[PDB]
Write a protein that binds this ligand. Structure first.
Ligand SMILES: CC(C)/N=C\[C@@H](O)COc1cccc2ccccc12
Ligand SMILES: *[C@@H]1O[C@H](CO)[C@@H](O)[C@H](O)[C@H]1NC(C)=O
Length: 431
């Protein structure tokens, strides 16, 4: 895609902190950028749309390469069009804004590069307020193995880059992304909703879901893929799980893992109020060159340090962190194939963390599965009493996009106090 000039692109500021054991925490003047799929796409020479509603203009876009040459991504009115605001340290993502639904933004080091986070033997911490983020919605904060320049160096057809939020990939190998590898994804374009569609290509990479949650349920989940870095896929390679990527991931959802009273409204982690989420990425030898061996989670709320809940499932050791053994046990216990291990498990996840990943923040609803995999019974055809089927208490009828978009359009999530750095350094304790 080309870089449009009709609307200035001004990235909201969202400061973060980098932390070391000896030096403490220091601010970084980071910013956020709207993902390219949400932007206006129009002829490079004027104002005519290349994409309107859920279809491309086949005059401007008869093929992927021609489209990318003819068409430009443009600047965004963050608040007015997309419901995205920042105080400078706290990011608010509103659910519906006019006909716009959801958003995803990435953390930038500066105006043309994503912040590249290298979290092996490090920790990531943030605060979240989900008080207004109900059943069926997901406020997600996650890492993807995107390129810092959004693909510009690799793909001559992409002249827009990180400044316009290009180069997305994730473990689901999504085919709804409009620009991949510097080409419009117009092949066999298929409408999937009023403003969305899919093309013949998907875009795949390893993904670490630090936080997928609403006020009913939360999960953290590594998803390794066999490839390294953002990869365009077609055919069977795009297929979730059996293709390049572990689409299911090895998830830790406290409720799915058998503690139904740990996290939710008025629970131990009280989702009716803001709280802090710490995630630590430990290696076997406590070095940044070691193999990722454990992902730990600590919460802080009202100054109380809250350890993660323990798993309580027959055949699963009662642990409270993600390890390769936990993954094998829960997969067997839940009847799920260990695609996670098939793609190389935590070691493979760690190599992606080691090479650096980009931080995404998003609010969304789910047209495929109504978010039931997060907060209800999934699959919808299994007995909810079987180990693993039940992930939350939301009704099995909840989360249909047409419903939540009309019923709770002013839902929002607030992500703040973003910090990363040495293990144990982004937060402190005292007696
Ligand atoms: C934040 C996103 C990109 N991370 C991963 C999510 O897409 C996981 O989604 C999912 C995970 C597992 C099963 C599913 C079934 C239907 C729809 C989505 C599913
Ligand atoms: C790594 O650190 C952990 C604490 O999380 C500690 O228990 C362990 O002894 C350390 N291992 C080595 C090799 O120093």
């Amino acid at each position: 895609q080309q870089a449009g000039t009709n609307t200035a692109e001004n990235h909201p500021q969202l400061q973060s902190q980098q932390c070391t054991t000896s030096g403490g925490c220091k601010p970084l003047s980071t910013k956020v950028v709207l993902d390219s799929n949400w932007r206006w796409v129009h002829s490079t020479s004027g104002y005519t749309n290349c994409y309107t509603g859920n279809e491309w203009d086949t005059s401007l876009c008869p093929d992927g390469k021609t489209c990318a040459a003819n068409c430009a991504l443009d600047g965004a009115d963050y608040s007015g069009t997309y419901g995205i605001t920042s105080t400078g340290t706290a990011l608010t993502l509103k659910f519906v804004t006019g006909s716009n639904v959801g958003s995803r933004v990435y953390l930038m080091a500066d105006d043309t590069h994503y912040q590249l986070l290298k979290l092996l033997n490090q920790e990531f911490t943030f605060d979240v307020d989900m008080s207004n983020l109900p059943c069926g919605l997901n406020g997600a904060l996650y890492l993807s193995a995107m390129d810092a320049d959004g693909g510009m160096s690799k793909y001559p057809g992409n002249k827009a880059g990180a400044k316009y939020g290009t180069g997305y990939c994730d473990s689901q190998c999504p085919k709804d992304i409009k620009f991949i590898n510097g080409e419009a994804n117009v092949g066999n374009w298929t409408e999937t909703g009023s403003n969305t569609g899919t093309g013949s290509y998907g875009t795949c990479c390893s993904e670490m879901d630090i936080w997928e949650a609403n006020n009913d349920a939360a999960a953290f989940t590594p998803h390794p893929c066999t490839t390294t870095g953002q990869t365009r896929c077609s055919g069977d390679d795009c297929a979730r799980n059996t293709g390049l990527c572990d689409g299911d991931g090895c998830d830790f959802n406290s409720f799915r893992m058998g503690d139904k009273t740990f996290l939710g409204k008025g629970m131990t982690v009280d989702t009716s109020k803001p709280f802090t989420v710490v995630t630590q990425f430990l290696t076997n030898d406590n070095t940044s060159t070691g193999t990722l061996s454990e992902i730990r989670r600590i919460y802080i709320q009202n100054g109380k340090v809250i350890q993660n809940s323990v798993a309580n499932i027959p055949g699963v050791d009662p642990v409270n962190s993600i390890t390769d053994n936990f993954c094998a046990q829960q997969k067997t216990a839940f009847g799920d194939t260990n695609w996670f291990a098939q793609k190389g498990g935590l070691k493979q996840m760690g190599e992606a963390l080691g090479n650096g990943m980009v931080l995404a923040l998003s609010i969304w609803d789910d047209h495929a599965a109504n978010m039931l995999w997060l907060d209800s019974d999934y699959p919808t055809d299994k007995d909810p009493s079987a180990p693993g089927v039940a992930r939350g208490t939301c009704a099995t009828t909840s989360g249909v996009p047409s419903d939540v978009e009309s019923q709770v359009p002013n839902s929002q999530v607030v992500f703040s106090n973003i910090k990363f750095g040495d293990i144990g350094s982004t937060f402190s304790g005292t007696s």
